[PDB]
Design a protein around this nucleic acid. Structure first.
Lengths: 175, 198, 49, 195, 207, 52, 174, 52, 171
RNA sequence: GCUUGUGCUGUCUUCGUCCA
C-alpha cells in the first residue's frame, strides 16, 4: 500500500533540512485541522502545562515512524500507542490518560506525508529557477515570502512575480 | 499493390494468405475478432508492431490487443441481446435505497439513469436486483387528478414544459421517453405532479 | 390451456351424456407429460409438468 | 473555492470511512453459554417474493462452514402441514441449529417470521447441544451481500445444481457466520453498496 | 469486534419495504390503490404494499352527504395524505380530504431565514412563473356568410364608404368568439356598429 | 500481490507454517514487511500436540 | 435527416482510394467535392468559410431573424436565446463563444479585404478553398509552420506564402 | 446566482433546491456540512448555478 | 471547418394545420428541426441563411393517410471536422487519462498516449493540469491540436485529437 | 384474503356444391 501511494512520487528520500521542514509542515497542518480538539484539550486539561508541545512531539514521532521506519497505521496503532497518548498523576494521585491521536489522525498524517512532496518538488523547481535567474543581490521580497511559503498557491504567486519582474532573464534563458 | 510507380499500382497480384499480414493505421475503426475483449470497437492510437493499442468505444478506455484479433469495421453495430440479466429500459434496483433505468447496455457494463438524474456506470453483478412491479403498482396520478398509465403521453407545465410518453413509474417519479431530447435517448425523469395529461 | 370451459368434464376427463355443449367447449380432456422447467426452484403445488 | 472543495472532500471521506467502519465491524452471533467469537450453527429460511406459488427453501450450515441438508417444502406456509414439516425438520437428530435467520423480498416475509417465531415459542424448540435450556432465536437478516452473492459466478460454480433462492439462503447463513468475509467476497461490488 | 447487530423497527421496515422512515412519515401525500369501499371505512394498498385505511370522517367532504359507495369504486387510484404510520405492523392511516391532500406542498424544512435566503428574488421568480402559467392560445374566427368580411372596424367603414346607404357588412367582434359586430351605413361617413351576442353555439366558428 | 506470493511460497515449502520466525529464516518475507505483519498473522497452538 | 442535392451513387464493383476523408490529401468526399450543384442544377463551386466570414454570416443571419421575429424594430446571449431549442441554444452558444475567442477579424471591411486578397491573387487562383479557409482561420505566421500544419500547401510551391501571411498579420488587429 | 438553466430546472424535487436562493453563508461553517458545498459545486458543473 | 451547403428536408404536416399560416408554421417547424442538430454525414448545422424566406413548394397528399408531405430546400452553414486537420481548442476538463477540449459544439478527447511525456499531469495543482517546465495547460487554456480520428454516432460526433507533433500544445 | 387462464399442423387423395 505504501508502494502504491509512493509510486507517483519522483523522489521520496528527502534531505535532513527538508525532512525537518516536512515534520514542521505536518505539525502545522494538523494544528490547523484539529483546532477544535486542541481547544478542548487546552480547556478541559488546564491543570497540565504544555500539552500542545506534547502533541507536537507525538506528531513528529509518528511522522518519524511513517517516513523512516515505514510502519503502517495498524502497526503504529497497536504496538506504538504509548507515543500517541500522554499520562500524568493529578494532585489526588489520580492516574489520567489523555489520548492525543487516533487512527484517523494517523491516516491523515499519512495523507499529509504524501501531500507534502508535491510542495517540495514545486519549491525545488522555484528555487532552481531563481538560481538560473542569478540575481546580483538577493531580492528581500522573494526570500521573505519564500521562507514563509507553505502552500503551492503562494509558490505559484512567487513564480508569477519572478517571471514578471525578471521577464528579460527568462526570455534570455528561453510571449 | 501500392507503390510510387503508377504502372505498378494498376496491377493485381494473387498472393497466398499464408504470407500476408494486416496493416493497421492510426485512427481507424476496428472491431475485435476474438479474445477477452471480443466485439469491442474503437480507434487505433498506437501501433507497436505485433501489439496494437486502441481507445475503445464501449468502455471508452485504451485496450491492448494483438493485431491478429482485429478486423477493420467502420461501424460497431453491437447487439447486446443474450447478455447480462437486463433488457434495455429496465427499471433496475441499484442498491437498498437507489433505483434507475438502463439507458445503454454493454457486454459487461450498463448505463443507469437515477431518479434524481445522475448517471452511473456499473457492472451487471453490482446491481442489487430488477424491480418487477405489478401493473396496479405501475399507475400514477397527474397534477389535475387524472390517472396516467404506462404508454399515456403527458406534457409538463412547470419548468422547461417538455413532453414525453410514460415508460416507467416509480413512486411519484415518471420516466418519460421523448423524441427531441437526444442527450439520453429520450429518457428524462420528472415527478407526476409536474405533468398534465393530453 | 384453451379459452373454452372445463367445468363440464368429469373426474375421468370425459363429459357425460345429457349435458348441453356450445362451441369450443371442452368435451374430452387429455394431457401429455412434459419435462419440468427450473420451477423446482420452489413451486409447492403450481409447477407445470 | 478549490481549498473549501478539498477540505469538504476530506471531511466527507472521513465520514464515509466511519460509516463503512460501522458497517463491517460485526462479530459472528454468539450462541448462549458459549464464548464470544464461536461460529454458530445456522438455519435460514426464505420463500422468495412471497407470492402464491413460491415455496420455502431451507439451508442448514454447521459451525465448520459446510452446507448440510438443503430441503424444499411442498405445502402452503400458512397451513398446519408446513408447521409439522418444520417441527420435524428442526427436531431431527442430525440438525441442531443455534439460530434461525429469515429474510425476503417484501412484506410477506413478516408472516413467515411471525409463523416461525410462534411455532418455536409454542413447541418450545430449544437449542440441542447434542441443564439450562434456551429457545432458538429468530431474527431478520440484512441481505446486502446475499443478493449479490446469488448472482455471482463463483456461487454458481460452487453449487451448480442449486437454484438462486438456495444461493440466497446460503448467502444469508454465510453472512450470519462471518459478515466480514461476506463483505470481502463481493470484491469490486462492495463499492456499489449503500455506505 | 462489536456484538452482532440486531435490526430495530426502522431497520426492519427499511429492509422489507425499501422506504426509509424519513421518506414515509406523517403528512406526506402518496397515490394509493383502493381495494375495499364500505359505508364507514375504506381499505387501500400503497405502491410498496403497505395496507392503508381511511375512515368515514376522512373519505367525504364536510358539505357532502352522499354515500361513500357512490363516490368511489374498487380498482380506482386516488391521492391521499398520511395521518399515522405503524412501523411495526406495516399499517397506515390516510385522509382524502382537500385540506390535507393539496395544501401541504412545502414538505421540506428549507431554512427560509431572511438574512440567509433571498426571499424577494424567490417571490419575483414565482410571480413570473404564475404570469407564464397564465399564457393562453387564441386564433381568428372564420364565418361563411355572403355579407361577412374579415375586416376591422375602420376597414369595414372604408368598405362601406364605396357602397351606398343601407348596405350591410359583418365583421368579427373584439369581445370574443361568442360575439359578432354588424356594421351598416347610416349615412355618408356615418356608420353604426352593433354587437350581437350568440347563444347555444355549436362551435366557436359556427353561428 | 505480496499475499499471493506468500501463499505460493507456503504451498512450496509444504502448506504449513510452524513458527512466525520461518517468515524470515526461510526467506519468505523481507525484514520490514515481516516486522509489520508478524503480530497480525497467528498460528493456532494445540497443547496436546506440543508437549515440549 | 437532411438530404444532400447529390443522389444516385448505386452499387458497383471497383473500389477507389479517394474515398476516405482526409484533410492532408485534400480528399473531402463526394458531398464536399470541389464541384457542386445548386437547386437549379447549374455548376457550383465548394464554398469554404473562414472563422471571420462564418462569424459575419452567422451574426447577420441571426440579427436578421431576430429583427424579423420582432416586427422590424448585438448581445451574443440574447441573440442565441432568439433561436428555439435548448440543445440548439447550447450549440449556438458554444459556436458563438468559440468564434468570439478566436475571431481574427471582427470587422466587415477587414474580412472583405482578406477575402479579396485571398481570392483575386494570381497565386491563389490555383489554391483550394479549404486551404484558403485554413490559412485565414489558423492565423499562421511562418511558411514552415503553415506547411507543417497544412501538408497540402507543400506541393504548391508557386505561391508567395510569406508575403500573404505578413499581409494577413498586418490586417489582423493587434 | 441562477443561470437560465438553473432558473428553469431547479424544481422542488431536485436536491439543488436546498441552496437555490442561498446567501450570507460564511466559509467557516461550510466544513461542518460538506455535502451542501459539494452539491453546490456539482450544480455549478452542470451549468445551473454560479457560486460567487 | 465551416462550409455553405444546399440542404433539403422532408416535412410531414397533419391535416389539422391546413390553415392560412401553413407556410410560417412549416418554417418554424423546419427551424426547430434543423437548427442545432448534428448529422454524421454533414457535421453540425449551426444556422440557416434567409430563414424567413425559404420556399416550401406544394405539398403532396399521402394516399391513405391524408397528411401532406413537403420538400423544403434551404442553404445553411455547416461545420465538420476532417481527419488530419489542425484546429484550435479550449480545454474543458482535466483527467488522468487525458484532457477533454471543446471545439464549438464538438468535444474532442485526447489520450495521454498522444500527449508528449514532458507535459506531466499534476493533480495537486489548483486547478489540476498537464504541465511541463515551460508549458502549463489547464482548464480554459488555449490549445492547438490536430484531429486524428472521428467517430460518428446516430446524432452525435466524437473526435480524437493529438498534440504530440510540432506547432501544437499550449498557445 | 381472495382473484381467470389466452391457441394450431402440413401434404396428398377422394367425394361433393354453384356456374360453365
Amino acid at each position: 500500500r505504501f508502494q502504491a501511494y509512493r509510486k507517483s512520487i519522483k523522489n521520496y528520500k528527502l534531505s535532513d533540512v527538508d525532512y525537518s521542514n516536512e515534520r514542521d509542515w505536518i505539525v502545522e497542518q494538523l494544528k490547523l485541522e484539529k483546532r477544535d480538539f486542541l481547544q478542548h484539550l487546552t480547556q478541559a486539561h488546564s491543570s497540565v502545562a504544555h500539552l500542545e508541545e506534547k502533541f507536537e512531539a507525538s506528531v513528529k514521532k509518528i511522522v518519524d515512524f511513517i517516513a523512516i521506519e515505514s510502519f503502517e497505521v495498524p502497526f503504529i496503532w497497536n504496538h506504538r500507542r504509548d507515543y500517541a497518548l500522554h499520562t500524568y498523576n493529578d494532585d489526588s494521585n489520580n492516574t489520567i490518560i489523555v489520548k492525543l491521536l487516533n487512527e484517523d489522525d494517523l491516516w491523515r498524517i499519512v495523507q499529509l506525508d504524501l501531500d507534502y512532496h508535491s510542495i517540495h518538488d514545486k519549491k525545488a523547481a522555484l528555487s532552481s529557477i531563481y538560481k538560473q535567474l542569478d540575481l546580483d543581490v538577493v531580492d528581500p521580497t522573494y526570500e521573505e515570502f519564500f521562507g514563509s511559503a507553505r502552500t503551492l498557491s503562494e509558490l505559484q504567486d512567487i513564480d508569477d512575480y519572478l517571471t514578471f519582474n525578471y521577464s528579460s532573464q527568462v526570455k534570455n534563458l528561453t510571449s | 499493390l501500392h507503390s510510387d510507380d503508377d504502372t505498378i499500382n494498376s496491377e493485381t497480384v494473387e498472393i497466398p494468405t499464408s504470407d500476408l499480414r494486416k496493416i493497421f493505421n492510426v485512427g481507424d475503426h476496428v472491431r475485435v475478432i476474438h479474445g477477452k475483449h471480443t466485439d469491442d470497437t474503437g480507434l487505433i492510437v498506437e501501433v507497436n508492431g505485433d501489439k496494437v493499442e486502441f481507445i475503445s468505444n464501449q468502455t471508452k478506455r485504451t485496450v491492448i490487443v494483438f493485431s491478429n484479433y482485429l478486423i477493420k469495421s467502420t461501424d460497431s453495430t453491437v447487439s447486446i441481446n443474450e447478455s447480462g440479466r437486463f433488457e434495455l429500459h429496465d427499471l433496475v434496483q441499484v442498491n437498498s435505497d437507489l433505483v434507475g433505468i438502463v439507458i445503454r447496455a454493454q457486454k459487461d457494463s450498463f448505463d443507469v439513469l437515477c431518479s434524481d438524474g445522475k448517471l452511473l456506470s456499473l457492472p451487471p453483478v453490482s446491481i442489487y436486483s430488477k424491480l418487477n412491479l405489478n401493473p396496479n403498482q405501475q399507475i400514477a396520478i397527474d397534477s389535475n387528478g387524472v390517472e396516467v398509465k404506462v404508454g399515456d403521453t403527458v406534457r409538463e407545465f412547470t419548468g422547461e414544459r417538455r413532453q414525453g410518453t410514460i415508460l416507467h413509474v416509480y413512486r411519484n417519479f415518471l420516466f418519460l421517453r421523448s423524441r427531441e431530447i437526444v442527450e439520453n435517448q429520450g429518457v428524462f425523469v420528472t415527478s407526476s405532479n409536474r405533468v398534465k395529461t393530453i | 390451456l384453451k379459452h373454452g370451459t372445463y367445468e363440464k368434464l368429469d373426474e375421468d376427463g370425459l363429459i357425460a351424456p345429457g349435458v348441453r355443449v356450445s362451441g369450443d367447449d371442452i368435451i374430452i380432456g387429455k394431457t401429455t407429460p412434459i419435462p419440468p422447467d427450473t420451477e423446482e426452484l420452489g413451486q409447492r403445488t403450481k409447477y407445470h409438468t | 473555492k478549490e481549498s473549501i472543495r478539498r477540505d469538504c472532500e476530506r471531511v466527507l471521506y472521513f465520514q464515509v470511512k466511519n460509516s463503512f467502519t460501522k458497517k463491517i465491524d460485526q462479530a459472528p452471533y454468539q450462541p448462549p453459554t458459549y464464548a464470544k467469537g464461536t461460529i454458530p450453527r445456522v438455519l435460514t429460511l426464505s420463500f422468495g417474493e412471497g407470492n402464491r406459488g413460491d415455496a420455502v427453501l431451507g439451508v442448514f450450515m454447521d459451525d465448520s462452514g459446510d452446507v448440510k441438508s438443503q430441503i424444499k417444502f411442498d405445502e402452503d406456509f400458512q397451513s398446519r402441514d408446513f408447521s409439522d414439516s418444520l417441527t420435524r425438520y428442526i427436531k431431527s437428530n442430525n440438525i441442531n441449529p443455534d439460530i434461525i435467520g429469515i429474510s425476503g423480498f417484501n412484506i410477506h416475509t413478516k408472516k413467515l417470521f411471525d409463523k416461525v417465531n410462534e411455532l418455536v415459542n409454542e413447541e418450545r424448540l430449544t437449542i440441542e447441544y447434542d441443564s439450562d435450556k434456551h429457545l432458538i432465536r429468530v431474527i431478520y437478516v440484512n441481505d446486502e451481500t446475499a443478493r449479490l452473492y446469488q448472482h455471482s459466478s463463483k456461487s454458481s460454480a460452487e453449487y451448480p445444481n442449486r437454484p438462486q433462492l438456495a444461493k440466497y439462503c446460503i448467502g444469508l447463513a454465510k453472512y450470519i457466520q462471518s459478515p466480514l468475509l461476506e463483505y470481502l467476497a463481493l470484491d469490486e461490488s462492495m463499492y456499489s453498496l449503500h455506505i | 469486534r462489536r456484538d452482532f447487530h440486531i435490526l430495530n423497527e426502522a431497520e426492519i421496515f427499511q429492509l422489507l419495504t425499501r422506504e426509509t422512515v424519513d421518506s414515509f412519515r406523517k403528512g406526506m401525500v402518496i397515490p394509493v390503490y383502493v381495494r375495499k369501499v364500505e359505508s364507514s371505512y375504506m381499505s387501500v394498498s400503497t405502491q410498496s404494499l403497505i395496507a392503508g385505511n381511511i375512515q368515514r370522517q376522512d373519505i367525504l367532504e364536510p358539505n357532502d352527504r352522499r354515500d361513500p359507495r357512490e363516490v368511489y369504486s374498487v380498482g380506482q387510484t386516488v391521492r391521499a395524505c398520511i395521518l399515522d404510520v405503524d412501523y411495526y405492523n406495516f399499517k397506515c392511516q390516510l385522509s382524502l380530504l382537500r385540506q390535507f391532500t393539496e395544501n401541504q406542498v412545502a414538505g421540506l424544512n428549507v431554512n427560509r431565514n431572511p438574512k440567509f435566503w433571498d426571499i424577494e428574488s424567490e417571490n419575483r421568480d414565482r410571480q413570473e412563473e404564475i404570469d407564464k402559467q397564465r399564457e393562453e392560445s387564441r386564433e381568428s374566427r372564420v364565418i361563411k356568410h355572403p355579407f361577412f368580411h374579415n375586416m376591422k372596424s375602420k376597414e369595414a367603414e372604408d368598405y362601406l364608404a364605396a357602397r351606398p346607404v343601407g348596405d350591410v357588412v359583418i365583421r368579427p367582434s373584439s369581445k370574443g368568439s361568442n360575439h359578432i359586430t354588424i356594421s351598416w351605413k347610416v349615412a355618408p361617413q356615418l356608420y353604426q356598429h352593433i354587437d350581437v351576442l350568440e347563444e347555444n353555439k355549436d362551435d366557436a366558428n359556427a353561428i | 500481490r505480496k499475499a499471493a506470493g506468500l501463499i505460493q511460497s507456503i504451498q512450496r515449502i509444504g502448506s504449513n507454517l510452524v513458527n512466525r520466525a520461518h517468515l524470515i529464516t526461510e526467506q519468505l518475507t523481507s525484514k520490514t514487511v515481516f516486522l509489520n505483519m508478524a503480530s497480525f498473522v497467528y498460528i493456532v497452538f494445540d497443547p496436546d500436540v506440543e508437549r515440549n | 435527416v437532411s438530404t444532400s442535392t447529390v443522389g444516385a451513387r448505386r452499387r458497383r464493383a471497383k473500389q477507389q482510394v479517394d474515398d476516405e476523408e482526409n484533410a492532408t490529401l485534400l480528399r473531402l468526399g463526394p458531398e464536399f467535392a470541389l464541384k457542386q450543384y445548386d437547386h437549379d442544377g447549374n455548376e457550383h463551386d465548394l464554398i469554404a468559410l473562414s472563422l471571420s466570414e462564418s462569424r459575419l454570416l452567422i451574426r447577420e443571419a441571426l440579427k436578421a431573424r431576430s429583427r424579423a421575429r420582432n416586427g422590424g424594430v448585438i448581445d451574443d446571449d440574447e441573440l442565441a436565446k432568439v433561436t428555439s431549442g435548448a440543445v440548439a441554444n447550447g450549440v449556438v452558444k458554444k459556436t458563438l463563444d468559440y468564434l468570439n475567442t478566436f475571431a481574427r477579424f471582427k470587422d466587415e471591411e477587414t474580412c472583405t479585404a482578406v477575402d479579396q486578397l485571398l481570392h483575386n491573387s494570381s497565386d491563389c487562383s490555383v489554391l483550394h478553398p479549404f486551404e484558403i479557409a485554413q490559412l485565414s482561420s489558423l492565423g499562421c505566421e511562418d511558411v514552415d509552420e503553415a506547411i507543417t500544419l497544412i501538408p497540402s500547401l507543400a506541393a504548391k510551391k508557386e505561391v508567395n506564402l510569406q508575403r500573404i501571411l505578413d499581409e494577413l498579420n498586418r490586417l489582423e488587429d493587434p | 446566482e441562477l443561470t437560465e438553466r438553473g432558473k428553469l430546472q431547479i424544481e422542488p424535487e431536485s436536491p439543488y433546491f436546498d441552496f437555490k436562493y442561498a446567501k450570507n453563508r460564511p466559509i467557516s461553517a461550510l466544513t461542518a456540512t460538506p455535502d451542501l458545498y459539494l452539491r453546490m459545486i456539482q450544480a455549478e458543473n452542470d451549468g445551473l448555478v454560479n457560486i460567487k | 471547418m465551416f462550409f455553405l451547403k444546399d440542404l433539403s428536408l422532408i416535412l410531414t404536416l397533419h391535416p389539422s394545420y391546413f390553415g392560412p399560416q401553413m407556410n410560417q408554421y412549416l418554417r418554424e417547424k423546419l427551424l426547430t428541426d434543423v437548427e442545432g442538430t448534428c448529422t454524421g454525414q454533414f457535421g453540425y448545422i449551426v444556422t440557416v441563411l434567409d430563414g424567413m424566406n425559404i420556399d416550401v413548394g406544394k405539398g403532396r397528399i399521402i394516399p391513405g393517410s391524408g397528411s401532406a408531405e413537403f420538400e423544403v430546400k434551404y442553404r445553411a452553414v455547416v461545420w465538420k471536422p476532417f481527419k488530419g486537420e489542425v484546429v484550435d481548442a479550449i480545454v474543458s476538463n482535466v483527467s488522468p487519462i487525458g484532457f477533454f477540449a471543446d471545439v464549438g459544439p464538438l468535444n474532442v478527447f485526447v489520450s495521454t498516449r498522444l500527449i508528449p511525456d514532458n507535459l506531466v499531469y499534476n493533480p495537486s495543482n489548483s486547478p489540476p493540469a498537464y504541465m511541463s517546465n515551460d508549458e502549463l495547460i489547464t482548464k480554459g487554456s488555449k490549445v492547438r491540436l490536430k484531429v486524428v480520428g472521428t467517430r460518428t454516432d446516430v446524432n452525435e460526433i466524437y473526435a480524437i485529437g493529438s498534440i504530440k507533433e510540432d506547432f501544437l500544445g499550449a498557445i
